[PDB]
């Protein structure tokens, strides 16, 4: 009924953010909407000031994220976390001019042993088409990463392309099956939702608005 694009986000370390104005940079357990929009953005070489392109992207695309557990030699490996005592010396003291602090400190959280399968699709008011997105994910223009730039991908961003009625149905065709799914679209049997502050307010730089995921447990 609808055509989906299927991506895999997998690497030794990932980081998907939560509200902070502080030096500790938190992570949640799966990709944020903002972040996925950012990933696609990087693929479609969109500069940071290009509010038109950013808005087009945001209004065109929607995501569903599945949390894939890792299995090594027939054993399950749970997603764990990591805190990096991250230091900066010679950091700007102010936005104007060149005075700087001897040392500042930050704490940054990462996800270890995490892997995701993402399904994205187009909205009825789409400015784009899926062929574009596929081409981009296969040949990105800006460097693609998993949250932070220090976080490479260990598997091609492109997984596949297909067609179904649910996101759930779409994702069924792609191993590993069995993980939880967080979708921007409702799936009939399922009633639980999960609140986040993912949604980028493109008109207002680096500020995010509340939204809700639909949860499809496995």
């Amino acid at each position: 009924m609808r055509s989906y694009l299927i991506l895999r986000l997998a690497g030794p370390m990932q980081a998907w953010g939560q509200p902070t104005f502080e030096g500790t940079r938190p992570t949640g357990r799966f990709p944020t909407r903002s972040g996925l929009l950012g990933l696609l953005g990087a693929c479609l070489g969109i500069q940071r000031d290009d509010t038109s392109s950013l808005q087009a992207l945001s209004e065109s695309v929607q995501f569903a994220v599945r949390c894939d557990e890792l299995i090594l030699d027939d054993r399950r490996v749970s997603v764990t976390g990591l805190r990096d005592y991250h230091t900066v010396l010679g950091a700007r003291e102010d936005y104007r001019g060149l005075k700087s602090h001897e040392t500042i400190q930050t704490w940054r959280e990462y996800l270890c042993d995490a892997s995701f399968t993402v399904a994205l699709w187009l909205t009825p008011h789409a400015t784009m088409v899926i062929s574009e997105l596929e081409k981009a994910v296969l040949k990105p223009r800006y460097t693609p990463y998993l949250g932070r730039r220090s976080c490479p991908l260990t598997h091609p961003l492109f997984l596949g392309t297909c067609q179904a009625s649910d996101p759930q149905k779409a994702l069924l065709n792609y191993e590993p099956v069995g993980g939880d799914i967080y979708s921007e679209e409702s799936v009939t049997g399922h009633h639980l939702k999960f609140t986040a502050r993912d949604e980028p307010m493109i008109t207002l730089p680096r500020q995010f608005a509340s939204r809700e995921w639909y949860v499809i447990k496995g």
Binding site: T161, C162, Q163, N173
Partner: protein
């Protein structure tokens, strides 16, 4: 000339399970208030269709599927030498009503019969069409003018010319509707059957047997009445306008198959490879089944087979004399039986009967 060929068959099977339902139970049916074991028409049709005798004497069966991707690849591999690949792909797309990417899962909306020869011919027409910058809708308009030249392709798809086809999309939705020429009934036993039940196990060669739980498989034996008829006019039409001779040919092959072919279900383990004990073929203006001969369930004496055949004969007398049926009739029977009314030509062998059919019931 009579338009309808009636085929009646009496075939007795040894213990078996030739057709079952969603829960592994023999298909039955109630007739005359008693339970008969039943073999569905579909099961028969497909048994004939995929049979060796069909492959040798009739041709290639159609290819029924819903997976347009797999079908695509098949078409490429089998037609690639005669057509360019996206001629092929575009043909498949036009006929199906679905976009043929090189995605490797593309489903039609239902399982449908595909005849490769038909597809070939369409490929020609569309190659022709785009050498001529001709529009798809216009091509539709053209091909609709002469449907006979489309039906002529069903000589490489006789099963469909016999059993009809309907699609729900693509150009087939206006080009592919075939009204089947052969009407066939579910086979039912001429007598009541209470099925038997096999209580089975599976020995585990590595554990001490001990107490076990036993499975159960319903099974029975029985004398089945097969009926089918062929609308010669309709078959001729469905074959692009073939002669009555070719129709009588196919009809003959159907008689053979309906007298010899048995569904493959559970045969490796019950092996009821039985040949028919009676076959009667009757030409007519209005088709008519003889099922009512067994409305009063046949009761057994020295078996079910003899009484069944005599039942069939007596009813045939009644109906023939009653409705005034002056049509060619011939009967083949492995038993020497009480004499059916003499206006029916006895045949000592099946091939003699078949030659009698090929020759329009005069030989």
């Amino acid at each position: 000339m009579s338009n309808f060929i009636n085929i009646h068959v009496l075939i007795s099977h040894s213990p078996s399970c030739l057709n079952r339902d969603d829960m592994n139970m023999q298909k039955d049916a109630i007739f005359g208030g008693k339970r008969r074991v039943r073999i569905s028409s579909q099961s028969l049709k497909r048994a004939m269709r995929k049979s060796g005798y069909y492959a040798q004497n009739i041709g290639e069966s159609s290819l029924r599927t819903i997976h347009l991707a797999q079908l695509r690849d098949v078409l490429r591999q089998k037609l690639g030498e005669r057509f360019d690949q996206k001629i092929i792909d575009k043909t498949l797309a036009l006929l199906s009503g679905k976009s043929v990417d090189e995605a490797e899962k593309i489903s039609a909306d239902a399982v449908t019969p595909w005849v490769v020869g038909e597809i070939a011919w369409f490929c020609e027409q569309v190659a022709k069409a785009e050498a001529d910058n001709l529009d798809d809708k216009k091509l539709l308009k053209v091909l609709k003018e002469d449907i006979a030249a489309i039906r002529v392709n069903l000589q490489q798809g006789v099963d469909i010319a016999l059993s009809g086809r309907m699609a729900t999309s693509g150009m087939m939705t206006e080009l592919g509707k075939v009204d089947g020429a052969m009407s066939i009934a579910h086979a039912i036993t001429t007598h009541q059957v209470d099925s038997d039940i096999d209580w089975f196990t599976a020995v585990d060669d590595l554990q001490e047997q001990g107490s076990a739980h036993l499975g159960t498989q319903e099974f029975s034996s029985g004398v089945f009445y097969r009926y089918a008829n062929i609308n010669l006019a309709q078959l001729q039409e469905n074959l692009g306008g073939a002669s009555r001779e070719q129709a009588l040919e196919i009809a003959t092959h159907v008689v053979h198959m309906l007298a010899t072919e048995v569904p493959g279900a559970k045969q490796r383990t019950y092996a009821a490879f039985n040949p028919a004990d009676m076959v009667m073929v009757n030409f007519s203006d209005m088709p008519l089944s003889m099922a009512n001969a067994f409305e009063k369930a046949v009761k057994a004496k020295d078996g079910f087979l003899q009484p069944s055949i005599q039942a069939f004969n007596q009813y045939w007398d009644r109906v023939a004399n009653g409705y005034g049926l002056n049509g060619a009739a011939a009967q083949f029977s492995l038993s020497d039986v009480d004499p059916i009314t003499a206006q029916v030509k006895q045949m000592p062998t099946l091939e003699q009967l078949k030659s009698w059919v090929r020759n329009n019931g005069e030989a």
